[PDB]
């Protein structure tokens, strides 16, 4: 009953609508993030999901108290009765504050008036991605947040600890399938708007895409299609149906592979690294088809070799047997050295 009396005194005359220190000082809000699980990064929508314990701490002299306990730990129902920062994510997109079983938010009021207001959020924040280097790309996905109604002269945000140590990611929270969270770097800036200047806390999560999935899904099938185009070189020239089926198969297969590569990506007007890889692979297979046509022009005799004249093995085929694997290997070395070595 004593604690109920204290809470009644705290809310007696309290004005939910006015920030702490209105007309006296700026309201400094020290903010922290404990990423419970870095949720899946949706490249198609250029957004990422992150599950966080978003903590906020600010001093409110109205909520100063003296009692048997130094820290009143309270449920979410008290939070709605007090002023809390109107924080929002500048790049947020359809976040959710979890409700099960109860509203997942804690409040702790220290006897000096300091508040600790934490909430469990699943935030789908926008991450603009420049996919030129995709799939070897690295992305500094931001999470900008700040007040909506309060300008820098009204509410200022701060990190509760050192900026390096104020965003902690759990060891087992990595829900990334095709990404590796290298780390996070934080900063604080100012944004100019039609309504005023707003303090914006930015934290960039540095993600490096894991190329293994695309190695198995795209690069290996493309390489195998190229090699399937080159077995046609090794085959004899007279088997026109055989090599025709081979080359047409390889070209159509590379067509469907190219389309399967694009639909896995968000739409963009520029070509990614895999688009260039597929373009050169398509050039190789189409060159194999053109090579087959070239040798087919000089196929004087339609009948195949038997153990009567006989066709000689095509010179173009013999040079191709070495050139195509050498050009393709040199291209692979150049490509992988160009992108892998990059920072």
């Amino acid at each position: 009953t004593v604690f109920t009396r204290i809470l009644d005194r705290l809310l007696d005359g309290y004005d939910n609508r006015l920030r702490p220190g209105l007309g006296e000082r700026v309201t400094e809000v020290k903010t922290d993030i404990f990423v419970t699980s870095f949720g899946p990064v949706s490249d198609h929508d250029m957004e990422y999901t992150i599950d966080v314990f978003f903590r906020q701490s600010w001093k409110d002299e109205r909520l100063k108290f003296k009692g048997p306990m130094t820290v009143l730990r309270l449920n979410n129902l008290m939070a709605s009765k007090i002023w809390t920062p109107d924080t929002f994510f500048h790049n947020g997109k359809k976040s959710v504050a979890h409700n099960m079983t109860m509203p997942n938010k804690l409040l702790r009021i220290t006897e000096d008036g300091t508040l600790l207001y934490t909430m469990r959020l699943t935030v789908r924040a926008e991450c603009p991605m420049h996919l030129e280097d995709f799939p070897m790309d690295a992305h500094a996905c931001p999470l900008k947040f700040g007040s909506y109604a309060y300008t820098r002269a009204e509410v200022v945000y701060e990190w509760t600890r050192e900026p390096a140590r104020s965003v902690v990611v759990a060891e087992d929270g990595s829900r990334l399938n095709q990404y590796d969270l290298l780390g996070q770097t934080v900063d604080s800036g100012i944004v100019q708007s039609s309504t005023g200047e707003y303090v914006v806390m930015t934290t960039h999560f540095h993600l490096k895409r894991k190329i293994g999935y695309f190695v198995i899904q795209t690069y290996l099938p493309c390489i195998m299609t190229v090699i399937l185009s080159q077995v046609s070189f090794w085959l004899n020239r007279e088997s026109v149906p055989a090599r025709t089926v081979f080359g047409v198969t390889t070209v159509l297969t590379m067509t469907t592979l190219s389309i399967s590569a694009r639909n896995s990506l968000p739409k963009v007007a520029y070509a990614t690294a895999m688009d260039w890889f597929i373009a050169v692979c398509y050039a190789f297979v189409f060159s194999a088809l053109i090579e087959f046509a070239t040798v087919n022009y000089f196929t004087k005799r339609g009948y195949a070799w038997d153990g009567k004249t006989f066709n000689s093995v095509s010179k173009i085929d013999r040079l191709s047997r070495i050139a195509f694997p050498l050009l393709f290997g040199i291209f692979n070395l150049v490509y992988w050295a160009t992108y892998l070595n990059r920072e």
Partner: antibody, heavy 117, light 105 residues
Framework: EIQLQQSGPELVKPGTSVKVSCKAS????????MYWVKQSHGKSLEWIGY????????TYNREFKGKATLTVDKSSSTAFMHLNSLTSEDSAVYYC???????????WGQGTPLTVS | YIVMTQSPKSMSMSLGERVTLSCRAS??????VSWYQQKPEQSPKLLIY???NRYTGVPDRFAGSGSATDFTLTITSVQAEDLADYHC????????FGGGTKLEI
């Protein structure tokens, strides 16, 4: 006008401990962390550790870990640094700094020359 | 910790001339870099908090800017009172101040 008042210079021989105080008056002591820095003669400033006055949570430098003990007095509103196992290398000038936020140290102490020989 | 390096350990600038300093950080420190002024036998005095912002009560001539790692402080014109040692410190991680630069005549 915030003014961090440190103690005067100390004379001491090696192998004994010293206590250097830092008194703040303008601002309320508990609101902001207190940092201790030492600048060896003609060298760069060197951070030794900081203490959150409200709950006395303290963090030290790895180089100075275990050599300096930081404490606070709410009633006296004063931060104390206790140096143990003094050596000739310790000779330097200490300051206490006030961290307004994670952008700058707003005020600094006058400086307490430590002499050991 | 983070290592802060100042390239021109000592330079002489004619009175009234523009003088520019430099401060380097080992790795990312964001905008969390401050510039302080230490006159002989005096405590440091804050000049430029953050990458660009200037502390209250400081002459307008002081002004600095920097990227994530490199930083610079520029004085529009040196004055007799401006002769002192200039430090650069960072607060992105635990504090670690730089070597410091000294100006003469």
């Amino acid at each position: 006008e915030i003014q961090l008042q440190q103690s005067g210079p100390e004379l001491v021989k090696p192998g004994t401990s010293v206590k250097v105080s830092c008194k703040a008056s303008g601002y309320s002591f508990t609101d902001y962390n207190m940092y201790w820095v030492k600048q060896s003669h003609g060298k760069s400033l060197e951070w030794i550790g900081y203490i959150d006055p409200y709950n006395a949570d303290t963090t030290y430098n790895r180089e100075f870990k275990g050599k300096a003990t930081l404490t606070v007095d709410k009633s006296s509103s004063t931060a104390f640094m206790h140096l143990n196992s003094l050596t000739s290398e310790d000779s330097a000038v200490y300051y206490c700094a006030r961290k307004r936020n994670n952008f700058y140290f707003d005020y600094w102490g006058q400086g307490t020359p430590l002499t050991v020989s | 910790y983070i290592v802060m390096t100042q390239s021109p350990k000592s330079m002489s600038m004619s009175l009234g001339e523009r003088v520019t300093l430099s401060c380097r950080a080992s790795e990312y420190v964001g905008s969390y870099v401050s510039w302080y002024q230490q006159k002989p036998e005096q405590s440091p005095k804050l000049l430029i908090y953050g990458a660009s912002n200037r502390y209250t009560g400081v002459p307008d001539r002081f002004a600095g800017s920097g990227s994530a790692t490199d930083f610079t402080l520029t004085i529009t014109s040196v004055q007799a009172e401006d002769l002192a040692d200039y430090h650069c410190g960072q607060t992105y991680n635990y504090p670690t101040f730089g070597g410091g630069t000294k100006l003469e005549i």
